[PDB]
Amino acid sequence: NRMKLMIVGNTGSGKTTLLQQLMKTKKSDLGMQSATVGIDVKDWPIQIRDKRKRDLVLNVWDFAGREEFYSTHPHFMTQRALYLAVYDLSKGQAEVDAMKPWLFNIKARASSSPVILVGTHLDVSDEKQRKACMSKITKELLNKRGFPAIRDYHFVNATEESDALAKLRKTIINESLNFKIRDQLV
């Protein structure tokens, strides 16, 4: 079972930006070993005015092959996964509150999956925001029965390489390795 990394949070919080920067090496660019995307998910809006006025939107899943289909078995979607819960630090401690429904949803979907909390927009946040978010996390999110285990929490500018991002990148790799190894333990 290839380890899944699930990047969740609210729209605009910097998830795609954060992943871009995490994967940014350009020693080999982004050299994936398949010529085609394994799973392509896109919406297909269909206007059917000849039919009973029902503008139908299909959520289309294009699978490369059997390996990619197999990887979406409910067993694999719900078990072997590290979660990144991403929020915009520049919007303050309200965004930490908004991580709570995410953490309930992660615990429900994937009961064994650990979470790394990532505050983006550090560069456009102030110490008052940094401090209030830090306090709220340690008091209200860390080591709570009913939430995923929170392995670590980071504050990053997701648009650039930095010590804090390298540490996050290290944590995701190390946390992925260690997660795979423990679940083999009896």
Site for Mg ion in 105-134 (CB under 5 A): 109
Looking at 14, 47, 163, 178, which residue binds a copy of itself (CB under 8 A)?
47
Check residue 145 and report its DSSP letter: B
- Whether 31 has a binding-site annotation, put simply, is no
Site for a copy of itself in 88-127 (CB under 8 A): 101-102, 105, 109
Instruction: State the binding partner of 146 from ligand GDP, a copy of itself, Mg ion, none, CB within 5 to 8 A by kind.
Output: none
Q: By 3-state DSSP, what share of the chain in percent is helix, strand and coil, each rounded to 5?
A: 40, 25, 35
- Whether 11 has a binding-site annotation, put simply, is yes
What is the CB neighbour count within 10 angstroms for residue 14?
A: 23
8 A C-beta contact, residue 82 and residue 179: yes
Which three-class secondary structure string do you get for 147-171? ECCEEEEEECCCCCCCHHHHHHHHH
Q: Which two tokens stand for residue 64?
A: 């490369």
- 40 binding a copy of itself? (CB under 8 A): yes
Instruction: State the binding partner of 123 from Mg ion, a copy of itself, ligand GDP, none, CB within 5 to 8 A by kind.
Output: ligand GDP
Q: Is the dihedral of CA 178, 78, 82, 19 positive or negative?
A: positive
Site for a copy of itself in 144-173 (CB under 8 A): 172-173
- 132 binding a copy of itself? (CB under 8 A): no
Which residues are near Mg ion by CB under 5 A?
15-16, 36, 77, 81, 109
